[PDB]
Subunit: 342 residues, 5 copies
């Protein structure tokens, strides 16, 4: 029979289908099974506390008013232009700050109706999602980015969100992030929002992202190491060259302070100490201790023979003491920041 007649004889003014009424209006709640395909992932900015994701959101639910038997097709596709005429769940994202559809040539939507009344509804979304980040252990950190799918208008007695049993979250093949490694396992949990209006259904998925240390080794750790070794260079210069030793120590301290200021250039104004802050503070303490050691040597050496050999002994002990103490600090630091993360 004519495919144009089936579209408005299954549903519409002739059949009496109402898009403002639930599939089971007075009875059990409608169960919507959701799954997501992550087309792209990235744009994780720590300053704005959010990340941008592109997903295909798939909702499956049973509508007994859309069941058909006379058509010989088991499952049939639709056009998106009639999606304003069917009932759809009022899903929304609790943590999103800005989102939009895609209309790039047509509406990026998919509708399938099965013979028993099963409805599959796939849509393409671009979400900017707020992520509360614990910026302690900041270079060696694992962040947890959440996604909450919630019903804005329907109480738990009317509508219930569930995750699909097989393949709840699937990721595009070859999807890589420039700054993180997205773990294979994704954690599903049942969030549930209680307000003064009622009890609303909610499903939460959280992703675990590990930051890579290559950029922070190249940018922050290795130049700070070179600044500390540059401070160690001062212990091999002779005693009586006051402008050389003082200028070296001053420039070392000022560059260390500039690097400590610039290490938090792309970070929010958090008020707890981080791993990179502790590293910068200890390196600044080391270069300041080197300059104070030279000040002690120069004060001792002008106290006039015993002063000369004592001030030479200070440099001799310092030459083997500063790299040894910094090596002990490096060993302890890298051990305790490679053990607490598990």
């Amino acid at each position: 029979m004519s495919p144009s007649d089936f579209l408005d004889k299954l549903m519409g003014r002739t059949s009496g289908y109402d898009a403002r009424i639930r599939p089971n209006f007075k009875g059990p709640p409608v169960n919507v099974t959701c799954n997501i395909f992550i087309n792209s992932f990235g744009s994780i900015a720590e300053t704005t506390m959010d990340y941008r994701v592109n997903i295909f959101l798939r909702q499956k639910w049973n509508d007994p008013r859309l069941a058909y038997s006379e058509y010989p097709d088991d499952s049939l596709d639709l056009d998106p232009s009639m999606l304003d005429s069917i009932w759809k769940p009022d899903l929304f994202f609790a943590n999103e700050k800005g989102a939009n559809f895609h209309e790039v040539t047509t509406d990026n939507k998919l509708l399938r109706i099965f013979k028993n009344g099963n409805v599959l509804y796939s849509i393409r979304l671009t979400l900017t999602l707020s992520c509360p980040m614990d910026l302690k252990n900041f270079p060696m950190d694992v962040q947890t980015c959440i996604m909450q799918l919630e019903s804005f208008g329907y109480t738990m007695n009317d509508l219930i969100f569930e995750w699909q049993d097989e393949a709840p979250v699937q990721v595009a093949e070859g999807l890589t992030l420039p700054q993180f490694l997205l773990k294979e396992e994704k954690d599903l949990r049942y969030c549930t929002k209680h307000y003064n209006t009622g009890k609303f259904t909610c499903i939460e998925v959280r992703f675990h992202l590990e930051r890579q240390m290559g950029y922070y080794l190249i940018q922050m750790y290795i130049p700070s190491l070179l600044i500390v070794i540059l401070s160690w260079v001062s212990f091999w210069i002779n005693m009586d060259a006051a402008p050389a030793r003082v200028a070296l120590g001053i420039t070392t301290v000022l560059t260390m302070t500039t690097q400590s200021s610039g290490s938090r250039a792309s970070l929010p104004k958090v008020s707890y100490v981080k791993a990179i802050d502790i590293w910068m503070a200890v390196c600044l303490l080391f270069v300041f201790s080197a300059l104070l050691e030279y000040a002690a040597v120069n004060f001792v050496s002008r106290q006039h023979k015993v002063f000369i050999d004592r001030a030479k002994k200070i440099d001799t002990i310092s030459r083997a003491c500063f790299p040894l103490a910094f090596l002990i600090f490096n060993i302890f630091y890298w051990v305790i920041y490679k053990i607490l993360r598990h």
Copy 2:
């Protein structure tokens, strides 16, 4: 009976309900009780003088034309698609610069009608709200962010906004800010706008936000302290090393000026002195006084035995005078900036 028939028999062309007419057209003003749930809070930029909030705004008002008795449900939910056909208050925000709804899969709207005609209307909004900030006491400050809910078109004789008696402002559990601590108590007050057009209803809520000092201690106060101690290092270097002492004092002064310039990098161009400005100015005065002290020593020492011991005495007094005077300044500063804030 049929749920499709009740929707257009309670209201519409058959009943005669008009969405352009108040619930009590010629009589007492309609009383709208409002409450808000803060889903997210943040993006407080001092430069653009605003902050971004995401809220659920709930309006409750009595519409006697929407009262029903024949339906056996005490309170019944709706679909958002019919919200263009009912009368809603013309609420707007007096201090917002930009705002939008959320349409992320459907309209993020909620409508409930009770048996007596009570209407509950919940909506999701993202507001960018201008906040006049008193940037005096700038690191140790408590800011007050206001939110005004006003009727644009209806005079006080037609429409009146009120706050809900229980739970006017409720905040999402676990909502934290990276730079502030939002106080538990929120202050409600009755703003009322008088124009040449008439007297319009208004309700104001103000939030108190305390800035945390951890970031400003790490970024501005501790490096300035290290620069001042670096200037104090000069008093232990010998007299005749003119390039060492002069280069140390010059680099100290230039770094202090650079830090004073950079402390206002993320601030609007206000024209009053702040706490961080006074701290930077006093630290700059201290390092300039250290360099002027060395200039005095070098001028005294070249005046040729009494000059040598007098110029050594200047350094000897300075070694115990500069940290003592800076300690007195620090004690007085931290006391007077921890007492005026209450």
Copy 3:
């Protein structure tokens, strides 16, 4: 009688009211009296040559087709949803770069109809308005920001804009700007645009904004003063310390050039000299003259007893000559930049 029937019996298909026809189609031009309430003012960026304002624009005009006598209300309010069905003037802003309405919960619009046919139409607008800025006298400047209200489609023989006799421009109470002081008096004038299409009505209001000098004193003038005094420190250091004097002069000159470059960091690329440019150039000339004075002293002192006392005399005269000449420059500068602005 029924309020629903009056809305479509005063105007619409039954009455014959046409929204595409002027109130006096073949006769005198319609006179629209406009007034504005400035809700917020700010975001004045010199780089993008514009400023952002939020206004309530009120238009009053007489429509004899909307006159009523049978209704006992003298002046009656409307709903904004019918504003597409009445005739409204085609006002637009000639200098705006981007503007939008506000739809934050409903349309932020107001319509009132009086008994004689007077129509009051209030709307909420956010305007980004281009301001041609004369950046001469740049810190001590008074800027004039204009706002032109023009008819795009109606010639002067059809439509005429006028300012309201009482209260043309009123400003929100407590509205303050972080960088300017908006004067109480606002200047109204009759702009009139002549094109090849015709003569279009126009009304112009201009605002006078005075820049405050506190931020520019803290940021640019006082640090430059400290750099100049830092250059004066060189005249009290002894002659034979060549690295100290040369390093002080070099660092002073380089910091002065860096500050002169950074003083125009938030300004458009104008090609005339400003007050801050002249101040920076004279301070750079002073520090360069100090370094050239030391070069003269060092060249004179190595010419070998008369050379030694002549080179000491150069420093002795310089010690009282550089601050005196800079004081004369400061007195002349501040006088001539506090007299021409009136």
Copy 4:
């Protein structure tokens, strides 16, 4: 007669006017004469290779189906709300990246119909237009910004764009640019786009903009001149002050490299040499040659009486050789960059 009846009796369902059909469907092509009024000009960013313009675009074309004789008005205005019902040319801009209309209180549109069927259609547009810039001769350059008006859907046999004979491009009085001077003469030419779909009409106007050199003299040329003179200061300092001469040369070279890096801070990553790049490279070569000259003097002077006078002779020749060679370079540079631009 009634003005409401003429609007739908001249055109519409009663007359049979179709807005999807050309004025001469099977015959000669419709000739559209276009002209533009530039309300504002600016926002020329070299990095994003575009500029923002605000124009009034006026199209005139003859529609014989809109001719009237019974109405006694020679030329009559319309309302913009009926512009969806008449036929309009499908003009578009070939080089625009983003554009929008203006709806600031109403649609910023104008329609006039003459007695013979002439249609004048004026609209307000804000265009972001891509400009291919030849950044050779970068401070002393004349840029050519083009604007192409093209028909997207109609072939040359259907629709032809032409420029108006009198006043094709007119500019607002008092329109000035902060960084350029727009020439009075504007060049019109007949672009014509050939694709695999067909031959489409096109009209091109190009504007000539001259960059002003005041900002680049203040920012880049004069500070580089001061750095070169600062390098020349080294030749008057004595021979044996190695830290003074070396520190002066090092700081001069580093500041010159920093200025050369910062001169391209607001420019795209072009891969040809510019005038400012050649100036920066020659100034860097001069300061590097000064430091290499001091290295030669210090190497010659330690070769031990003839060495001392030879190394003094090198400084003596250098004192008159470096400013003379730089003056020859400046004369040649400014001549060849003030002659090739014509």
Copy 5:
């Protein structure tokens, strides 16, 4: 016959044409041949991992329901306003982050219907397309930017995308990029997306872009070369000038670290080594080795005649050893980074 009657007699309610049904509903899949004309190309940002393109997308497909024989025109154009009434493929871009149409005066759309039912549909799009970039070999790199055209709602059994046999991708004449050279050959391939919903058609085109090395030679390589030669200057300065040699080495090392930090200022936080990172690291190693060589000379020279000539021999060997080793590194570097790219 009348052109208005043919438009709604070929298709519409009279003919029975349905826009929600495929041209061959139960039969072979519809074959859509696509081609693109690149109007503009650019805005390639490595940080946001995307590039902006402006294209004309042309789709050709056979619709037997749109075939006509009575009209004497072989191929006839349409108006875009009826494109909502015909069936169009649901093309979308799999890698786009944001896209929009152009409505700059009308809809930038083109429709042509042939006699046999062939439909040509041309549209103008502005796409922001994500490009996974391999930032190894970063200055001497060839990037591959992909474009995937996919059907969102139609399975491979319903709709198939194909590339046009002649001219699949054509580029505007004179289109140049400021930072790349787009190769003449474009690679077409058959992507095909498999999801849990079904098998969707896909066509991929990839572009090869070569980065030009002129900007990176001017900005990063030549100044680093000058810093390395500036470090080589130290070997010609005398032994006993400790502040000169130490200050030169310190300033050289600090400028090298600043340049190494600034070379990744406009790059994403990748965690692998690049060519510019290796160049910066080797140059930093060279300047650090020069300073360590001076430290070795100064330590050897103060060990007291044999020490003096040994420390002079270290400088003598270093003077010919540092440029020779850097020349060997430069030769090896430029060879291995001009051979692996093929």
